[PDB]
Homo-oligomer: A and B are copies of this chain.
Amino acid sequence: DRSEDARANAELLLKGDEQTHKQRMDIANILQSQRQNQ
């Protein structure tokens, strides 16, 4: 049970960080798009 919950929370936290850094990645795409736009 406790080893399982360790694994689960680890992977879930991992994909949460994937969503955060991917989201800020998209933000970076919009910023770079704006900076060479002009």
Complex CA gap A35/B32 in Å reads 12
Please give the count of copies of this chain that the complex contains: 2
| Interface size counted on chain A using CB atoms at 8 A | 29
Residues of chain B contacted by A14 (CB below 8 angstroms): 12, 15-16, 19
Assuming the contacts A7-B8, A12-B11, A23-B21, asked whether A36 and B37 have C-beta atoms less than 8 A apart, the reply is: yes
Contact with B along A3-31 (1 / 0, CB 8 A): 11111101110111111011101101110
A25 to chain B, nearest CB (A): 6
Instruction: Give the nearest-CB partner of A15 in chain B.
Output: B14
15 pairs of residues in contact across A and B, judged by CB atoms under 8 Å: A1-B3, A6-B8, A7-B8, A10-B12, A11-B12, A11-B15, A14-B16, A17-B23, A21-B22, A21-B26, A25-B26, A26-B28, A28-B29, A28-B30, A35-B37
